[model samples]
Target: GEEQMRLPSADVYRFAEPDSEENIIFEGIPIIKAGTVIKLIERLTYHMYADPNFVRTFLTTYRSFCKPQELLSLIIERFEIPEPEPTEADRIAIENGDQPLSAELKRFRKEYIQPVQLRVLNVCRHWVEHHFYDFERDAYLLQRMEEFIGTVRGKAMKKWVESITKIIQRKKIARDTFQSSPPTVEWHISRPGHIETFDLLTLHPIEIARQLTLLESDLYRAVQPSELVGSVWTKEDKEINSPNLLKMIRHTTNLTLWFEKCIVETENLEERVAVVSRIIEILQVFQELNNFNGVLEVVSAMNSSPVYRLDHTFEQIPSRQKKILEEAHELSEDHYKKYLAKLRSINPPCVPFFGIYLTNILKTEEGNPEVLKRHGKELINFSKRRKVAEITGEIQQYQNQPYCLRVESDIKRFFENLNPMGNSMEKEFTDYLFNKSLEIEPRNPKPLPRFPKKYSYPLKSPGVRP
Candidate 1:
């Protein structure tokens, strides 16, 4: 015997007639067909339909699918819809309070014309605010935007236009100053035992951690959403496509290499042990401050072949410090399982480990096709972009919250000036480090100073928290 399933109340669901415009459906969900540029603009400006995530993703990732000028022209054309005029008899009827022509006119303005125009202006405001670089790079776009704003008539619309105008002027001034004299600090490495501006042993671990967190926070905050689009930061022309991202990566690498240099460059075993422990203490502070990026940097330095092979030095680390190191190591284990969990559980003003997100975006781009054919029509794979946008949106959320720590100028300068091995001499630098390691403590000496087997974590994820 089979039991019958009961349906929900009729009020829970409504049906639209087939062949009606409102009945259009895709995969059981109502959708407006937008396979071409014109249709896309129409859907974007649909009356009474607004999605902020959709607009943000479109502006952030549209460069892959369409040219800026093409988009600008299409949006402008969509906003040029003509208004209907009333005849003399209809105007007279309206004055008599008959409301025949005036009602239709009001409906046309409210439902048809005003919504489209207002949405277009809203999109333009967002475009100008976030992606002003497009205008900065192209004079025509800027001129066209200004020209369109000038043509705007109503006070409601003019308010948005005026705000856009102020933004452009402000952005222009900021861009000019930024391009004229960018920060270009030269990298340098001092000889060991020659005292630098600040010594790792002498500086309070808390201040060191605070300064590094603030410096990295500034760098991370400077990264824009456009820079993360399409995994451009991983490409060779990354310097051109994602300069801020590159700068952040470079600083991260420099910090890792600086830690290694500090530990291995010292020949005396006792001082080397002290440096290693001090670095671990600083890493603990990094963990406490929720600077996952800083935690990863020191973790990387500790796990590098040169530093990891220093048996004599590591053996001297007290159990208390070693336990802390073990916990830090666990954060990066099992494909960053703990790291991802911690990132989600923490509050803002935290520097997330960006490497995992880079992998996530790269995997997302590779896994999803850029275009898809549905019902014999090729459509931009907007769902794929939405997925990527989700990741970038999380990154942008963390970037918004700033650490309240005050920056110590001397320590900031010291960290900035760290001379990481340049690409050309990477082999030489590693070889030098390996040779130094061997000189400090030869291999196969006294049963290898037994320790736990290091867990290797995958850089790629099957997985950010704000």
Candidate 2:
């Protein structure tokens, strides 16, 4: 029995080869051979804010990482620059005070109908990025992508296992780095601080017992503190139980139990962080999908609604949970110091947790926004991402002005405007004193004696106060 070659007990999706390069750098770069983009996103997230080695290990694949330029472009484009308000001339009917009813209706359509249509476009884009895998992609190191036209079944995805391998042999990034670039993948599980495949992906129920050994082994290992505040792993369940934590019990408890009961309950000798890591990723995916749908709806309502058309507003609702997750990526000592600051910025007294899975991790503050950012980017590229709701927005002031003047104006304005202004009469006095070397700069102050909204003096506009 010891001499026999052992077949994996779980569902091993055996590949003739890489299968396809389509999904190789879905997240950006690779840590494992068969890992998906979203899976890598989860891992990178855990590593960036969750795990310590994320940066050092991931640096081995720089170009392979999802391009930030690409990500930002995707988000901004999907979130179109809001239209400018109609000028008095443009709103002729309203300005002229004729056809007020018709003008209002037209304005309503512009505010409501147009935005909804844009939001729908975003939803379509979001769906494409998340669920669909394009076989016609040309990005990353994918040399060739072919459909499994001959075979039905799962062959569409399975065909890549063969197609990608042939291309890899021609252009090897590394001997073991078959996906896109050349980097040797260390497959040995017994290697120091390494985890084998079984510990990461479960082919069946039996692997569960095996990874328990891995978890317990490193149960007491030193965990490096995350650089940012409020972002570290404090696995002590006792600490998670607090008055404030009780409020999020449904979400946090479910996740903690998943980690504790699933991995902690196992009797195997292997201590694989990969197993729970995989589970965390799986949860992140679901959380993103579910929340993304809801967020898009909210963002769409803000951006595409009729009320927002005339007077554009810039507003956002960063999920108290989402932000809490981001702060978790930090190493802030207290919630107020790190996580709460961000929450207040989003909306005062905001709640940062939603999904039960994320709630468990937030007990100690491990939310990194990249997990959200990448997912957001993926959705935005596909049209599913959301940010601040639309209100009135404008073009780059410089676009309508000169290039040099546009940029210089801001800096000059900032520095010059810091000084107090004098009225026409005061200006003569101010100039004479300054040039003459006696600088007692006088400022005409505000409330600068306002004669009251309904001033005893005559007013220009009829409605002075609300």
Candidate 3:
């Protein structure tokens, strides 16, 4: 039964066909006869201003392989309006020096039907700005506009064309600026102060958290939808060369190593505990900043053999610091229920642990078929696409924000060498941690101070501790 029906497509259904009644209703307005609308679109596109109502109607019902290109061709095509000849009554009125009924009809009719080329351009420009994100795509559209302008011969049309060019020029500049701006953090070269040996005593947790958050934001922004899948971790036969993703992984590894290196470099036990304390503080900052991956890495570093084996050091951690670490640690465990709940409660301009969200999307996608069969016919599943888009859109919203952290080339360089992948320090680190653990004796639980209970019949056995 589903095979008996076919989905609507530009190849199967002609918009301008005389017998076609296909309409795209936009809000309260609908446009029918896609072909006629295409023609109308072509005329207004070059002529500039289109009626707002008509433009929305056209854009709504408009379907094509490439809407902007198709719209451009329609507008530039050689066509003109065929005015109806004047009737005898209209001729007589004109002969008597009175305005013809035809003139009045044309004038009044134009008030609704006609568009000023400039106004239409403005409307379409607004639509283009909101609907289009890719700079290259806008540039392609701009190129076509330039081509369309060259074909105009009339002085009035040329004047309007000049204005349109100026508008597009501004758009071009803005798009260019965004496209040309600094890309991933790896591309940055380290500066003098950034490359210098970082002091554990001097390194502030807030600065570390903020700087790393900025780095995460950079990687998040670099992620393109084309390189992703239903699950980022899923393996299909497809070859995915996602440099951005690999870089993110590498950066995360480096951050953990940097933490370990800082702890290992310190000779004093108190200083070592201080390093773990500062890291826990950084984890808290990561939570407040909504840097999910950042929290994961820091917590993982804290749980690693190098840090976790320092049982005596943990005992010395302040209660306030312990509380902060506990919350951060909970989010890194227990299926991340705490983290997910925390996320749903906070508002936007917040950076979410994007990896977890990506995994969630994969679960939804893997659980459902790409095509839904209803009544024996298969239809596209748009619902799934929208869900993924919503998550990605949130990432985009925050990445566009101005990060207040001071970006240092040296810090990035320092970060670059921090990962232990190719480093020979693994043996040294293991030996250091092993000796440190061996040097400490087993812990004995400290007794708590007792408070007198006012309850009359409450007595504890001498062997029992309260």
Choose the strongest candidate by TM-score.
1
Tens digits of lDDT, candidate 3, 21-111: 2322111323322223443443334233334545543343233113556665544432222234566999899999998889644742353
lDDT of 3 at 368: 60
Q: State the lDDT of candidate 1 residue by residue for 1-466, as single tens digits.
A: 1110121122331111122222232322134333444445656766657756557778988776777898898788777765455658887887788765555557667776688888899889899999987887789988988898889998668788888888888888898712243222211232223336355665566667777888888888888877887777876756766888888988987788778877777766767786788788778878878999888888889999999988789888889888878788899789899998999899876998887777888899999987666566567666676778788888888887676665557778877877857553767887878777776677784343233222122212110110
Stretches of model 2 off by over 4 angstroms after superposition: 1-251, 269-271, 280-332, 344-351, 354-466
**C-alpha positional error of residue 214 in candidate 2 after TM-score superposition, expressed in Å:** 32
Ranking by lDDT: 1, 3, 2
After aligning candidate 2 to the native by TM-score, how far in Å is the CA of 291 from where it should be?
7.4
Q: What TM-score do all the candidates reach, one by one?
A: 0.75, 0.16, 0.52
Residue range with the least summed lDDT across 10 consecutive positions in model 3: 457-466
Ranking by TM-score: 1, 3, 2
lDDT of each: 0.72, 0.27, 0.53
